[PDB]
């Protein structure tokens, strides 16, 4: 009559890494790193994004003629742009504080276009100017949301305009200044030389003067256009004055909603799906705390690490080999209803079992460990992407250094944490088996023989009931004391 204590084995292949051993085969393991995506650009929280196509933000806001499908645009979750868009400023020039404008646009999610200065109010100036830089069907055209003011007859009277913000929210306004190529152009389009453009609000004051010089030809023109923007607050007034070289606004963009968004630089197209975290390669649907798909993500996404394998050991070491011996010689492939268990070989029968209390305690501990590792990582909505000009390289280097510093910190911490936790779990399982063996030995005392292969041989004739008794935890030592003593001495 023998009783043996052991653990459980299977046909698993997955391997984990500990701080002392590498490539250790375990029974059950949990992957806490996500490596897959759907490869498609989908909606964020059920709202389709804004697809600029071949247009740029400046071209969309200014009203580039090759972007007329973007005039009235619905609700958006984020903006999709190309790395090198083709349809931007049709007329060669520049845009002041472009990056700040893009950063502001990353938190809007809806604009409403309001006609603040109609084109018919300029009754003392010509408002039908155009250029071949952005022409439609051959005939010259211009930006749709802007007005080019030239001379009427041989006179250019002082141009004045005003607007009071009675719309309901903040309103973005854009204006421009034209830099000619020679004095002949200046006198042909604005009569007099030595002009200025003055813009004034409650908290703004700007005066600009055109620059006339020969420049290299871009899109066939030696002239330029410089654009500036401002934010007008509620119940505030904006004033425009000009003697020449003014590209007036006709529309203003009031902010309808506000929230969290970003700019994704992709060359793909929207397709029908819905997710919660978006990457340029695809979308992520997971509950794990780590991923290694792409550094630039928008939404509520797991932490990004430079790792290829992060596996937490959830089960026992898989020694496949085992008269049936116990935990000294290896694991057991017979018993399948528990982690730690018994095997009895009495006359009534020979069979496996599984201790319930120890297995439940170990299961609770391991599950609590996994939940502590996973559910302690704070996740927040973020748009990890910023844009800097060619004269702000130091700030870009600063941002990059911060990002890589955090990446290395998190990578090192995650790898080391996984290694030590795996070691501790593997030690914990052996400790539990040894504790069960010691408990049985202490409770059951001298009436037996310790075969030393990991299990016990009784001296009396223990029937089934005594086997359940020793498994139960309540074993009557005095009952068999006399009978066991007789055979033990002989």
């Amino acid at each position: 009559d023998q009783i043996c204590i052991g653990y459980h084995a299977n046909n698993s292949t997955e391997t984990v890494d500990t701080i002392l051993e590498r490539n250790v085969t375990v029974t059950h393991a949990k992957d806490i790193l996500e490596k897959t995506h759907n490869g498609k650009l989908c909606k964020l929280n059920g709202i389709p994004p804004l697809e600029l196509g071949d247009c740029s933000i400046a071209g969309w806001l200014l009203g580039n003629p090759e972007c007329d499908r973007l005039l009235s645009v619905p609700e958006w979750s984020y903006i999709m742009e190309k790395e090198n868009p083709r349809d931007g400023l049709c007329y060669p020039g520049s845009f002041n504080d472009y990056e700040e404008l893009k950063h502001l646009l990353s938190s809007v999610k809806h604009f409403e276009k309001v006609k603040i200065l109609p084109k018919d109010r300029w009754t003392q100036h010509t408002t039908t100017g155009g250029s071949r830089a952005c022409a439609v069907s051959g005939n010259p055209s211009f930006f749709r949301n802007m007005v080019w003011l030239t001379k009427k007859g041989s006179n250019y009277p002082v141009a004045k305009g005003s607007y009071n913000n009675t719309s309901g929210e903040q309103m973005l306004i854009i204006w421009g200044v034209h830099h000619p190529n020679d004095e002949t152009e200046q006198r042909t389009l604005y009569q007099n030389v030595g002009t200025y453009v003055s813009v004034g609000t409650s908290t703004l004051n700007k005066r600009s003067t055109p620059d006339i010089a020969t420049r290299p030809k871009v899109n066939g023109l030696g002239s330029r256009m410089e654009f500036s923007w401002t934010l007008l607050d509620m119940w505030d007034t904006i004033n425009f004055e000009s003697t020449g070289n003014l590209i007036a606004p006709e529309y203003g963009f009031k902010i309808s909603k506000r929230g969290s968004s970003g700019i994704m630089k992709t060359e793909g197209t929207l397709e029908n799906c819905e997710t919660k975290c978006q990457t340029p390669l695809g979308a992520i649907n997971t509950t794990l705390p780590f991923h290694n798909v792409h550094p630039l993500t928008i939404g509520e996404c797991p932490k990004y690490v430079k790792s290829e394998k992060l596996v937490l050991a959830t089960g026992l070491r898989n020694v496949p080999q085992i008269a049936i011996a116990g935990f000294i010689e290896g694991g057991w492939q017979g018993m399948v209803d528990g982690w730690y268990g018994y095997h009895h070989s009495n006359d009534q029968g020979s069979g496996y079992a599984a201790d319930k209390e120890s297995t439940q305690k170990a299961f609770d501990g391991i599950t609590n460990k996994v939940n502590s590792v996973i559910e302690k990582m704070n996740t927040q909505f973020e748009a990890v992407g910023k844009e800097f000009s060619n004269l702000e390289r130091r700030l870009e280097n600063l941002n990059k250094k911060m990002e890589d510093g955090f990446l290395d910190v998190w990578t090192y911490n995650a790898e080391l944490l996984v290694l030590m936790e795996n070691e501790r779990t593997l030690d914990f399982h052996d400790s539990n088996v040894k504790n069960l063996y010691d408990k049985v030995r202490m409770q059951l005392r001298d009436n037996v023989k310790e075969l030393g292969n990991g299990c016990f041989e009784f001296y009396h004739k223990c029937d089934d009931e005594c086997m359940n008794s020793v498994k139960n935890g309540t074993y009557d030592y005095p009952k068999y004391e006399e009978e066991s003593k007789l055979n033990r001495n002989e």
Copy 2:
């Protein structure tokens, strides 16, 4: 005659958290998170703060007539300001590089004022100008630290002024330029159009031109004032030249004492009390390494984390349930002078005791662990909080992201460290008790009998000397070898 080994239990109700278990009762515990504050704005290192009240830094530095209390400010420890101060620039305008000026004023103390260009030296100009915005008792007035130069008679001669810095330290100088509303104002105040303001030092060269345009009315005026500042070095000269629109300074600001300070935005008042670390809600007086009062602190303060509980286990589990028995089935309540100890029962009266060597070793170990966790944190003076304009949103986002990332790193590290150390301590105590049990068993050998509940019953008569020897560690096996063997056989 029997001897039992066990541990200590009391009526404590403290609770800690481990990596495998939650809500575990312990005998003693230490809180390493501070969650309390005085509730008062104190004096840092004895020096009282600078209380601006309803004033701004610009108002204090320029001499707003309402803020006539702060004309003789003494030494300060930190600056207290309001989120939206009321008395700032009475005459509408702007202040260039305002945030850099505030950042400089952070690491300055005491501060002295020296008259450099007395108002009585401008003998060829008028100096009694004023406005109704900065009015005292109804009559018009102006800033106290600045002079408004206006034409005298019907002429405005070229205005020149030089100052050599022989004070003894670096100096702060502020000047301004006036932007009128119409040309009639310009001719009434300065008699000529097309003026300039030129400022020159050894490392500075600035030329500014007035802007005349119609603007929205702020405080009843359409005109504006633009203010600029510079830092004059020792033995360096500053030159002012102007044809019009010059607001000259009369007082320069010498830096008197340097150090470390900051700006705190609070709607509070100073009260008689002292501290060493300050928070906008109150003062912190603690030595613990972590706190969760407020993220914006001035001084040398513990690390800020987003947690509500950080408790370290410095004791044993509280399993208070014991024919005395030992450590197998629970702790004792009679032991009041040790952690691990003995209970002895013989013919000369039973009683408790306490093993001193093991208890002392464990106490020293736990003390070293707590001191290692606490004393390896670096605490340096810092003042969390900076200011950014409305055109620097990207820099503000960068600062916010950096602070949030560090906060997340520290929170995660602290929680995981506490959990792992709690698990290790709770295993350490069990290992110590089992070590004591094994040592006693090895000493006593076959002369005794084990009972399985944690203690031994002898096979001879073991009086107080015998049992003290067992506790002492010097137990004589040969002395009772014959006596104990005789009883064991039968």
Copy 3:
């Protein structure tokens, strides 16, 4: 006969610190912090650096007459500059976007100088002007890379220049503007007043106007020169137009190598050695993951920490003490070929041995632990120094905060990891010894007597063959069952 189980001891005095104890002497230990440098500056990847002597970057790029040793400069690995160079702008002035230029030079390893606007092309102007500030041998001179244009006779025609970039790479061009001290100087140098300087490329468009004012005397002059730079792209034209006050370029700097470099502030010369990582005090040659030599490093360097001692415990505890006893009364000094082993004493002699399996397993575990700690740190090329101007103090403070935060995080993590790992390995060794003792006891069963000091006394006659059978894990218990039985009961 007698067998004993023990561990190794030696004469080492290396001490390590754990989380529970301090100053624990160990047999072997490994230092993972580097503290040694050669105290010399030398080549990075074989290329000698660019030693600027007493010159500065601006003085080198503009051609200071006292910097004529750098007119033709070969390839470099990094740049060495003094903190306060004596030789800079000989003519007093400024240099716009200097820090951006230095950052650009922090990623270029070779320049090629190309003559783009020959000095003899200006046939309508005088090009021989020079000043006493940049004097050579007592005669007035000027920069060697720039041309000072001045009126010929009594006429200053419009000056026009152009250059088309057909060189083959990106190019750097620097121009200047002159600010005189009085109208007399302007009239004597350029005849006319009301002057502009215009520079134009396909992206850049700049117009500047001279300022005439009385300024403090620097280097004996009250005039200034302001320099600006631009990056011309391939197949792009740059145009210069001027009516006066133009300091034209004569040379352009084409990028020829491109790579990763940096600027180091030092005060020494260049020696003959080679290194992969460089610090201002010396070079580092190590494979360890941490160092405390200097924070400002250039190259591929280990992490910087503020610790003074980081030692990992590789060997076991040194407890020098003692037939002879076992592992409870100290470690054996006579064992030299292993970590854990046996001592045997029988009628054919006495001696020591070593258990190869346990020692090999422990050695592999410790090696893997050290390798895991060491080879999981990412070492990329980096340059830490960054330069900021006097108006960018907030940016500098943000940079300093990031560096301090990362330093603190890494120091805390390294120290805590070392302490915890030392405690775990010190427990690991004791666990291994106890496991060997338990294995021998289980194999030997009741045939022996456990003396209690780690030694077993046999109840029979055991020759050398039986002793070796015990050590190799193959003991035939039944064969000695009968013989050892008689001696036990007698």
